[PDB]
Homo-oligomer: A and B are copies of this chain.
């Protein structure tokens, strides 16, 4: 038939084949049988948490860290300039002496 939903319908059909083949007890039991799912939905919930945390927690934090690092380097440039100037002045003093 196909992947069509409402498996209740498939149960009704199968029960009808039972009844036509003269096992009414089996027919009633099947047509009234209620399927029950297992506890594997935990897997779906946990993988959802996997993805949620791996995206919000990891990547955005990495971006923030890298931008902060870039700002820090741009700051350190000035200290490099100052060190160069100071050492030049000290060399001048030594040459004078």
Contacts and interface: CB of A to CB of B under 8 A. Distances in A.
Given A35-B5, A87-B86, A80 B70 contact: no
B77 A82 contact: no
Given A76-B80, A80-B78, A97 B93 contact: yes
Interface of A: 1-2, 4-6, 9, 11-14, 26, 29-30, 33, 35-36, 39, 42-44, 46-95, 97
Contacts of A42: 48
A29 to B, nearest CB: 7
So how many copies of this chain end up in the complex? 2
Nearest to A16: B23
The 6 A-B residue pairs with the shortest CB-CB distance in the complex, in nearest-first order: A61-B66, A57-B63, A68-B73, A82-B87, A53-B59, A75-B80
A74 B82 contact: no
B80 A72 contact: yes
A14 B6 CA distance: 14
